[PDB]
Nucleic acid binder design. Sequence first.
RNA 1: CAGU
Length: 346
Amino acid sequence: VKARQHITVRLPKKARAMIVGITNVFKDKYPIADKLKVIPEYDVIEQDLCKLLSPGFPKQPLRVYKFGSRITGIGNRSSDLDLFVDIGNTFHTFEHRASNATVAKLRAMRKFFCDSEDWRLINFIEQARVPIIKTCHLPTGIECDICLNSMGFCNTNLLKYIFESQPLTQYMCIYVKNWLERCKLTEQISTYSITLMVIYFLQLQALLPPIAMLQIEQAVLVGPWVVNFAQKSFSELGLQQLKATVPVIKGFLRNFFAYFAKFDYEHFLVCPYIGQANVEIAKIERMLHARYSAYVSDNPECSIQLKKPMVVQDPIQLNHNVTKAVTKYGLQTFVDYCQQTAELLE
RNA sequence: CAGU
Ligand SMILES: [Mg+2]
Ligand SMILES: [Mg+2]
């Protein structure tokens, strides 16, 4: 891309094949994703985690929360399982950067996975924004990402509500998830990022509510972030729940890819919190709730990172641009692929 | 930059 910026990066053949062929998501991948929301294997994993860590922290409170794509219903059989281990009722505590205690806890847990004959330690990432332990649960073979941060569980619950209220959202996310993998873009643009882009797009079509309109104040807080939401019936908002049909899905996907092919990433951001068209990067910070403003006043270093090629704001952790690591050339690659994909969908 |  960098060598020939003037050339539209060719949509990879693996992607072209799947776009030109949409019945697979509707008839096969959807039922598997729906089944993967609840399977017996997850109970074994949570139980074995409690059994493994209960001795390491004897009197301490302990609770395990599942989240991620398997739980929201856009997973596949190879999908990893994401788990939040809360030791000591830290659910409501927000760490911008992982604290010493948090890193201390992760280090203690690392040893337990190594020594245990039911777990294989795969990786221990301490210096990430969200430190995680990557380990294989050997009885099931399921790869688990273990963290000490509640935010992923909270946005998983929000996706659950959105997908169940408007199933078209779920189908589209399964499709673009697979499209992202066949385009080999997942390392720059994550499945979670594209899910927020789908949600935002459908908000602009008046098929989903702005997240802010679900949070009119009693607030549940993880630090400064409002993590609960009114589970309002879509009828009360006049939001029609569409029947997901292959033509309906195809038309919305076409429009989705067309929209992000022409989106002005230099001046606007994807903003499911606001859920309105043309949210300017230059205006967004003054549009956020009072807790965000109070938090960044005391900590200006924790404001959302807006000076990035691609800005997609987490609807709950409002200081997180989930696409902050996307490069100009990764963005151009994504824009070119959107362009060619919209064409192939007519 | 790494879970989501
Ligand atoms: Mg996952
Ligand atoms: Mg994971």
